[PDB]
Design a protein around this nucleic acid. Structure first.
Ligand code: FES
Ligand code: ZN
Lengths: 139, 157, 80, 104, 64, 37
RNA sequence: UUAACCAUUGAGGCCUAAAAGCAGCCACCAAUAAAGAAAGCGUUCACUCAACAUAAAAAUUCCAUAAUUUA
């Protein structure tokens, strides 16, 4: 038995311890703002991929593009740019109606193509405005 | 605290919630338990401590909301089960769906209960002194708790 | 559900839950599923009003209402 | 329900392709406007006029050049349902090139 | 006739109203770009690098 | 409810449960996949 | 230590009218933020995973009695 007897004989948790202490996409967000004079923020309606394409393609025929970026990487430039009131708007899935001409009324008309999709606002002719204001300017 | 009031019109209204006691003894404690220097000093009978993490009907709160670290999210959960089975939380009984009455059988007093009483089979063959089978008492998750005895606590009785 | 009305104010403070709830309503597949309801979107705190054929009108405001509560409320009401 | 069933313009009969979907569930425009004897995609739901398939066009060219490859690409963007509205021509020319290489 | 294809633009006119009457030429004519061909700093290289990563998973996925 | 030494999921819909002191996999789609330890 | 998440044409031709990611056989690509002539599927041609985007991860009858914390 002594053989077994010999065999048996022969401070702060790192948990509580305090823990020791996009660039390409940044250009893309800058590029759309530089290239497109007006950026209209509309909620992404989770449209079908085939239906999403034709709307983008149909706008492409009208030389109008659709641009989408993640919100969290979009916060910095929106904080310091000509467009600063879109930060609360850019929550969740979103899309941008971006063009070269102030076709605000036609933008709603293309938006009216799918009635369920609403418009939240944005900027037209580099002027940031809400939808209620945009409708007045559209007239 | 946001709660729903029904009238049909139903409205959820945010109400003021009790605020946590300031100035924890241990500053910068990563886990709420350690913040208060209760890392290895609480047991099942500490109803006051455990009650701070339990739903009104006896359910456990999610880790995120509570903020406890997983190590203390399992130990706290384990102690809560022992407290319920020992009748230390009489005001957090299950919600009776349709006014159903309790089983009406008298409740046997139990404490330090590791497993559910329904899921434990009797040990008909006890075993001899050398081979004797042990009956579980307490839970292994509380091994690190401070011991004020000469020798370590006997989990298996 | 005979009609569903969702109104929210982008210009004023707008809760995220109602907007996230609204886009689900503003879906072709969802519209087809609830063929009975006439979906109308109002844009101008947020208030959601849904009308039923039997005459029960349910008004839901998103000021402090989470998306799950609205969806759960609608699901239960649809069952009748 | 979108159905992707079409036959050659020269052919004036729906043939096998059209019928099965209707059973499972429960064209003159092409014949005249576009040249006959060439297949073209359609999106019957609402038959829509469509441009001829390039791949068979490539086979027709092969009977089974760069200018021919480019020529088809320029006028290809003539449809909306097709989704063939990519303004940058690189998409179309590269696409047909990738189709030409794969086909024998 | 292969020569007829070059001389006359079949693509431009395919309507019955005609008889195939006759950066555009600067696009790539080469074979499919492999990881070696693609420029390491180009989006296509990283984009098609994901395809190669997808390739391995898809081959394993096919076997199941 | 075959009693086996090792319980292994047979489908994606399969889920695991710990009932009356033993491990169970119950599948809503197929009752065949139901097992016990 | 396991998660719900999204899913783009020139129909690639080929013996299977004709094969769309595809019965089938050879190629296996083109754009795209990001997609395999696809993982399954779908399809005699023509639901979705991977990508992108992603909250997380053995036979007569058991057999001392009992006990979790006083240095
Ligand atoms: S109690 Fe300090 S790490 Fe959790
Ligand atoms: Zn199963």
């Amino acid at each position: 038995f002594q053989r077994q007897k010999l065999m048996a004989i022969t401070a702060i948790n790192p948990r509580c311890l305090p823990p020791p202490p996009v660039r390409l996409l940044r250009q893309d967000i800058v590029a759309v703002f530089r290239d497109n004079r007006m950026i209209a923020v509309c909620q992404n309606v989770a449209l079908s991929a085939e239906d999403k394409l034709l709307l983008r393609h149909q706008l492409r025929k009208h030389k109008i593009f659709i641009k989408v970026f993640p919100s969290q990487v979009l916060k910095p430039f929106l904080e310091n740019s000509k467009y600063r009131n879109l930060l609360p708007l850019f929550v969740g899935h979103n899309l941008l109606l971006v063009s070269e001409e102030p076709k605000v009324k036609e933008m709603v008309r293309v938006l009216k193509s799918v009635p369920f999709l609403p418009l939240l606002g944005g900027c037209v002719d580099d002027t940031i405005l809400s939808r209620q204001g945009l409708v007045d300017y559209a007239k | 605290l946001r709660e729903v009031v029904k009238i049909t019109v139903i409205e959820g209204r945010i109400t003021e919630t009790p605020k946590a006691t300031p100035d924890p003894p241990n500053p910068s404690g990563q886990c709420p338990i350690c913040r208060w220097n209760l890392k290895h000093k609480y047991t099942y009978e500490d109803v006051l401590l455990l009650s701070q993490f339990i739903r009104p009907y006896g359910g456990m709160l999610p880790r995120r909301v509570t903020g406890l670290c997983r190590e203390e999210h399992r130990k706290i959960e384990e102690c809560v089960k022992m407290a319920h089975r020992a009748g230390l939380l009489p005001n957090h009984r299950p919600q009776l769906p349709e006014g159903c009455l309790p089983k009406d059988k008298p409740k046997l007093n139990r404490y330090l209960t590791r497993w559910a009483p329904k899921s434990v089979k009797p040990i008909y063959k006890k075993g001899h002194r050398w081979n004797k089978v042990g009956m579980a008492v307490g839970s292994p998750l509380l091994k690190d708790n401070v011991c004020y005895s000469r020798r370590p606590l006997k989990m298996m009785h | 559900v005979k009609l569903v009305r969702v109104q929210f104010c982008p210009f004023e403070k707008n809760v995220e839950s109602t907007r996230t709830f609204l886009q689900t309503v503003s879906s072709e597949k969802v519209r087809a599923t609830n063929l009975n309801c006439s979906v109308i979107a109002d844009v101008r705190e947020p208030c959601v009003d849904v009308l039923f054929g039997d005459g029960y009108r349910l008004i839901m405001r998103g000021a402090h209402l989470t998306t799950q509560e609205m969806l759960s409320a609608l699901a239960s009401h649809i069952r009748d | 329900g979108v159905i992707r069933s079409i036959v050659r313009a020269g052919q004036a009969i729906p043939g096998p392709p059209l019928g099965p979907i209707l059973g499972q569930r429960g064209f003159n425009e092409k014949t005249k406007d576009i040249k006959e004897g060439i297949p073209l995609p359609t999106k019957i739901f609402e038959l829509k006029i469509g441009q001829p398939t390039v791949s068979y066009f490539l086979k027709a060219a092969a009977g089974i050049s760069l200018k021919h490859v480019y020529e088809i690409a320029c006028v290809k963007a003539k449809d909306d349902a097709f989704a063939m509205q990519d303004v940058p021509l690189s998409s179309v020319v590269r696409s047909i090139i990738g189709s030409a290489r794969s086909l024998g | 006739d292969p020569t007829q294809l070059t001389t006359h633009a079949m693509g431009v006119n395919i309507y019955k109203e005609g008889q195939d009457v006759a950066w555009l030429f600067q696009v790539n004519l080469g074979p499919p770009k492999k990881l070696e061909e693609l420029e390491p700093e180009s989006r296509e290289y990283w984009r098609l690098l994901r395809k190669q990563n997808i390739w391995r998973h898809n081959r394993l996925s096919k076997n199941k | 409810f075959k009693t086996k030494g090792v319980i292994k999921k047979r489908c994606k819909d399969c889920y695991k449960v710990k009932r009356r002191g033993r491990w169970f996999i119950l599948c809503k789609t197929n009752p065949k996949h139901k097992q016990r330890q």
